[PDB]
Design a binder for this molecule. Sequence first.
Ligand SMILES: NC(=O)c1ccc[n+]([C@@H]2O[C@H](COP(=O)([O-])OP(=O)(O)OC[C@H]3O[C@@H](n4cnc5c(N)ncnc54)[C@H](OP(=O)(O)O)[C@@H]3O)[C@@H](O)[C@H]2O)c1
Ligand code: SF4
Ligand code: SF4
Ligand code: SF4
Ligand SMILES: [Zn+2]
Lengths: 306, 208, 385, 176, 57, 71, 114, 94, 152, 90, 111
Amino acid sequence: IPHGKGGRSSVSGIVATVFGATGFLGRYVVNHLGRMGSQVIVPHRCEPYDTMHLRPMGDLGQIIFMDWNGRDKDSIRRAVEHSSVVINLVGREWETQNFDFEDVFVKIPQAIAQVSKEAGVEKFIHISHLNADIKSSSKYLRSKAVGEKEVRETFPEATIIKPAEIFGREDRFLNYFANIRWFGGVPLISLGKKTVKQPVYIVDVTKGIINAIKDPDARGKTFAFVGPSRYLLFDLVQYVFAVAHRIGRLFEISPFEPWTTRDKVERIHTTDKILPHLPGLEDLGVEATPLELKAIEVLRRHRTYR
Amino acid sequence: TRPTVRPRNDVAHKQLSAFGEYVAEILPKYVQQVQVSCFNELEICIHPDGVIPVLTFLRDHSNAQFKSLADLTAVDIPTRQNRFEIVYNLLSLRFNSRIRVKTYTDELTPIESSVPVYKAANWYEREIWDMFGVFFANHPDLRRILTDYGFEGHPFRKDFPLSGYVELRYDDEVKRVVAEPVELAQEFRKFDLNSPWEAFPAYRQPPE
Amino acid sequence: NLTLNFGPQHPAAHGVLRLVMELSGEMVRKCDPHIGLLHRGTEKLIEYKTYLQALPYFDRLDYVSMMCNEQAYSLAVEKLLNIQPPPRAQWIRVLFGEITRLLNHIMAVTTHALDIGAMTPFFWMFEEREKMFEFYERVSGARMHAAYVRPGGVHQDLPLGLMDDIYEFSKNFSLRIDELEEMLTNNRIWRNRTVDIGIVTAEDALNYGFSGVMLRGSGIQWDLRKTQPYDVYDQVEFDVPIGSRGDCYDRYLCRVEEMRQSIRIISQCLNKMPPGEIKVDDAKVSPPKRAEMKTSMESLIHHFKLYTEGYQVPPGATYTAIEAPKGEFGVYLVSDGSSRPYRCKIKAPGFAHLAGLDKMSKGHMLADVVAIIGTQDIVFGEVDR
Amino acid sequence: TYKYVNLREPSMDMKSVTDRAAQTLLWTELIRGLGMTLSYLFREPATINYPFEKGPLSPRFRGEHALRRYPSGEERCIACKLCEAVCPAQAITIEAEPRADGSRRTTRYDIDMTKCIYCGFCQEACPVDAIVEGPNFEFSTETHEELLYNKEKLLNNGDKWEAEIAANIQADYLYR
Amino acid sequence: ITVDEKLDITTITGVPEEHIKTRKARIFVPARNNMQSGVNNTKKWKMEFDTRERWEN
Amino acid sequence: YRKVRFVGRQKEVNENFAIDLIAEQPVSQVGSRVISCDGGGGALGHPRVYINLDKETKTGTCGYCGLQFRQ
Amino acid sequence: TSVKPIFSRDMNEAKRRVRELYRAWYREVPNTVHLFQLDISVKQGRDKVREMFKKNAHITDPRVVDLLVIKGKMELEETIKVWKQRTHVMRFFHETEAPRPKDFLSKFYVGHDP
Amino acid sequence: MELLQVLKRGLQQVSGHGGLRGYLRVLFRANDVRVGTLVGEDKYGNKYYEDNKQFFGRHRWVIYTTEMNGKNTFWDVDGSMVPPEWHRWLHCMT
Amino acid sequence: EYVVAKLDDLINWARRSSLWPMTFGLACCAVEMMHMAAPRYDMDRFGVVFRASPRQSDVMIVAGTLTNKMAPALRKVYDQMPEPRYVVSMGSCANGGGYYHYSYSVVRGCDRIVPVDIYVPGCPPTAEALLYGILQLQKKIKREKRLRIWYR
Amino acid sequence: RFIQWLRNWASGRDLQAKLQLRYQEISKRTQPPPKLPVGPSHKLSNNYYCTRDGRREAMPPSIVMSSSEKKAVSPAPPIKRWELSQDEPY
Amino acid sequence: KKTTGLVGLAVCETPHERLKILYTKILDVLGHIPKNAAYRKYTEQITNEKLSMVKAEPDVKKLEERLQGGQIEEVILQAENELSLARKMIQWKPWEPLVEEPPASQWKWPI
Ligand SMILES: NC(=O)c1ccc[n+]([C@@H]2O[C@H](COP(=O)([O-])OP(=O)(O)OC[C@H]3O[C@@H](n4cnc5c(N)ncnc54)[C@H](OP(=O)(O)O)[C@@H]3O)[C@@H](O)[C@H]2O)c1
Ligand code: SF4
Ligand code: SF4
Ligand code: SF4
Ligand SMILES: [Zn+2]
């Protein structure tokens, strides 16, 4: 039950559990959850130091840290046995040198579609992507839609969220551009055909979750994230060099965190403005952000004044 | 009466009864009350029309040097119909004597400041502006000392509560250190301490 | 003109005091510093406490003085309460009140000689300073911050010892002050580093309201140490130093002779202490003893009530000041008539001693300005008055 | 009284300038003085090897909180609340209750070891001499969430040792 | 002199934030804690404001 | 509800209790009227208090003393 | 009123002073927005300037407005120079604060009438 | 010629206690190399050496050896491993 | 692997063998650290050198009491530190702000601004438990860099 | 020894005022149990309240306020000067 | 002597007549004030008391006694400002009676 103002040091009733939560998306969401005040239970994988910058968001006693692998069961069960809701955002890009990378979007959402669901949770929310389709593209883009249906058997009502491409501060897609200081700046691939997708802004992403976390009645009715106005152009790549004026890796360097001349280069150039009959963002309001105002912030190059 | 009682003296109680008497005699324009403390102190209650010249009279003489400006303070008193109370304290170098100047005022009514009369009031006079809002007249540089840049409170009066409203916190929402309404972990439990039965006979009020 | 703020820089000294410099090429001619890095809410905070409970917040007002602060408080309270303190107690307040001056006047030279940049006189004297904190721990309660002086005189008696220790300590100290005489006085470069710097000697050196040294060592003979008594403090013999001109090097040479006075007074105070009691006997102010608050009936009711509320102070304003080892120490303690005091405004040095940095600085270099500051001996947290 | 230091007119004659001329020109100063007072290096370094060696203390030294009890365990505390009303930081919070035997005891007992300003007045306010500032500086945990001491630290912390505590009171209670 | 006698009911603002119109004060007499019979704690009017929620931390 | 904050923290708890440890004392007896109780030793412990022992042979542990006192 | 004023006399030395420094703010809003290296649009700053002046327009008494003049002028001393290190200027905008409900049915589900 | 008259004092002081293994094992923790004359009794293997009454602050030094309550061998000691009876003595309180 | 995990017993040993601290002298907890610099409990040459420029730091130390006029200046210096950093705050007024705690203008905690790892309690911690806090910090470094990219 | 007198040629010769008190002739311990005298009129039959009136002193005496060949009396006699402390005033 | 003790002044130059002008400099300006305030009654009293002992006797050191200032060059400054004091006594009017009596209960201390 709630009490008083939710400025800080309140209760607000809810008890969530956010896995992953070390990347760009999962950190910034929880930084709202410790503001209204709740028992945020965040288990991390293998990183005691990489959560140090996380702690000064929850006040005192509100956050807690645990260890878990994911291919184990009870480490994903012992933590979640006392909560109310649970979301998940776990996953990444290219296949590890040790992992399997296919079932990580299949059995790992199923590993928390285990007794976890049976224990008595509700409003379990997974993430999707707007472009994850069952078609033969790509090795990473498809095999995400396999988890969208084969795991949808479990949790018959979820409201699995479907975001478009996101832009914020430290993502990969927008920082894939302007990290291309090279002997040639080529677009993908010297063509202005499909560019671009829908870059929804990161405040709208974290605002959609907190409205849905006690909405109510948002289970099963899956939602889609609208982007900006409206599709986007080829001008974006020229918009980079115009205004820019042309975490547990290793001790020295990681040997392979590459630009990946593989199916990475096509997972973004496959836009797929999908079905507008999903409700999915404006009804889970209110999210309305342009691009031209937030572009000064993330871009940072040598001029810095003019 | 006994040991462990302070032995008072009458010599300093005599001359300080003597010296301050002919002060009101030679300026019956500004002086409205003089009183002698029972432990060799003197108050000269002054309506603040004569804020400059009486100091200027004590600035120099041949029978009263008094050129050591020690203490400018400020005391608020609610339920007086003129709240505040500016109180000086100055020192005679050649004579070893303490005397204070009690000048009342109100909030909006300004006071002619002592800037040409003394140059030790350069940082003291600004402090009452920052803490109360008592706008002194004709100061060359009025600014903000000993408070933070965004306050609107003038905190040393009584209506300003113990904590402010401005408990500060950090978030990584973008970069900023943002303000927020104030939230404590504990009440500051306020006690109740005034015992009854009136331990003091001498200061007994007019019983009405 | 370049507007550098050489201050917040944690360049040794005391990384604080952030100010501006509107320098005219090389000379400064305009200095307007900012203060308020520690305001702490002190004078508002005391308005909810009682007299005994508010007492350590006077102790933490310096960094250095532990018995010279709270000396300016109990003596600011005992006048209101018509009490003279008992005679054995007064010989201890002069003893520790003339031992804290052997902590400021060691720190006031070494820390000045560190901004300047000398390394070795910082380590050559604090290693001898350790022989003195063992006293503080042996007598009161802690390393530095001791709630030791009470309004009812001394808290408790110092144990067996501390008389063949202080006499052991003080008989081997003048050799250590003869070290720094060889280190700085006869040297030329440090003399050349400070002569004719900060020549402030006129009657605006007193119209700025300065307290001692950056007084009398520049001229005008006056002090609060033998024109105004405290306790048994006039019954000892000593003299007060005066320097020649009005610069820093003739306020530096006060402090060498000042430490050569505190050794005499300690070697004069030990010969004159009588045996006696500790507290004031009438027990409406002092708590009764521990062996008494477990036997009689009268002891507990004048024990159990004396900690729920405090004393009963009569109304009427008061004021006093004593010799802090860097200046006067004004306390204008407004009393109301209950266990909880009314307004408690303090005057500390540094209000005068650093507002007059405007007059003192100009016409000079930028490297002069850091050498100015360690001569007035300004400590922050103490400018919170 | 007076003393006029650094007040001495120079010599100004034929021979005594040669003492002030050999000083500047050939540096009989600054080496006889400052090169000998530094060396002076042969003295013994007075350093404490802290994990092995330890320094001196006093029998009245303050530190960690603890609670005592009588011979065979009685909870010497009587919950008379006096340590609460004199704590300057209000680090004490006590809720009491009549225990079913009849004598009153405590239910919650707190010391805000963050807020605790160590005025030690709790040691000098208990009539039945319950709380004692135990002389052990063993500290430094890793969270803010841990240093708030509940009761079942303090009775345990008062019973990791007692002979350390019981000898210091018994050597000091005659003074106070 | 510049006396310029004029008339206005002095209502000062800007110093707090919003709690002018929100709250309502109360002026009363504290009257004899009746565990005992000392009447010194009369003769002074006091104030106290609105009381709002106290939850559990 | 609160049971999640100590997972892997082992719940450091007290072992002995003074809820009932008076009852294992050899309850004292005198056969007189009024007795001192400076128990725990003189000038320490609980203060002096005098108890009437006439009525169901006991005193009532004096509150302060704690030890069961009777005749 | 047996009290001398500060600067103004009656309402006409007053209302020309509040118009006066408004231009000093008005050329300042584009001047500082590239100086303090923060990124919003500049028209939002000009809206917030006139936001502050218009709200206190319910005064029918001199020397209070004149008291706000001294408050209004002292704001420019830190502003024209650099005495507010990228935070105090951002303190004007209640940005990351959660919205107050201000609606009766909305207050009723959350809160013991705050 | 003082390189041998104090070296005869230091020769037995270095070599004549434990030999080569008892010297090199205690060497690899600190410069605490001068062996104590008088010994203590308590408790485990931490014989609190009381020196020759020619020091203070460094006359009652202690030795940490091995695994008081399940710790590592030799290379992690916080100094809190002393029993809470020596705090009367190791701090020089009596 | 036995080959690769042998390497971080040098690197995670080397960082806990040379720490170059910054000190923020603000209040009375600054003075006691100077006595740790004084050669009784000689702070130098037990792994750790004396003062150092603000650029080249690993372990920052906040001592004393924070005011709202210092809360911006703390974060800016905290950004300029390199990556394997640690925050250790001594003094009871850096753990909840001691008392002064109910005052209108004191930062409540020195934890709602920077993330701090080791909390030494006390008005002045007596330069005796503070070397104990530093040996706690080197004891805290039992972390690994290998078997982090070798696992994931 | 030969390293000894090199300390005695440099900066004088002291040999006794060492910077450590760690050697002998530092006071080690003190034996006896203390007992405190209780002196200042703690006794009975004359030591008695309403004689010791340490509190209850009256109001500050008001001198002539609102509602003659005087000698223009100073607040105090002026400060007479100082001696010169005949040890070495130069 | 070449240093005047109190640093910041200079012995400049002649005693016994630099003073003797400046007392008589005040006494002529003293007659200008309308005589109803007793300011004249005490200020002319002490200057005639001073100048009678001032004029005109050796030595400088004897004039230090029976004239309780600092050194004799500083005794100039004791009356230097007093000349600047009495000429502004014509500008404002302290001989006028009291103005702005306080509203009948203000200087009562216990609230
Ligand atoms: N909305 C979009 O536009 C978008 C774009 C690209 C990708 N995504 C996907 O949506 C989520 C956004 O993630 P992000 O932008 O914040 O970057 P991210 O670094 O991938 O964050 C997701 C978290 O999953 C963790 N993780 C990866 N594999 C794991 C495993 N086997 N077990 C446990 N944790 C694992 C990652 O590292 P740790 O193991 O250290 O916790 C990371 O902390 C991810 O699932 C991502 O694949 C979304
Ligand atoms: S120490 Fe005293 S006041 Fe505190 S809990 Fe124990 S009996 Fe009660
Ligand atoms: S130890 Fe200090 S802060 Fe804690 S309760 Fe006792 S007096 Fe108060
Ligand atoms: S209370 Fe602690 S942190 Fe604050 S000034 Fe005193 S010693 Fe320093
Ligand atoms: Zn008993």
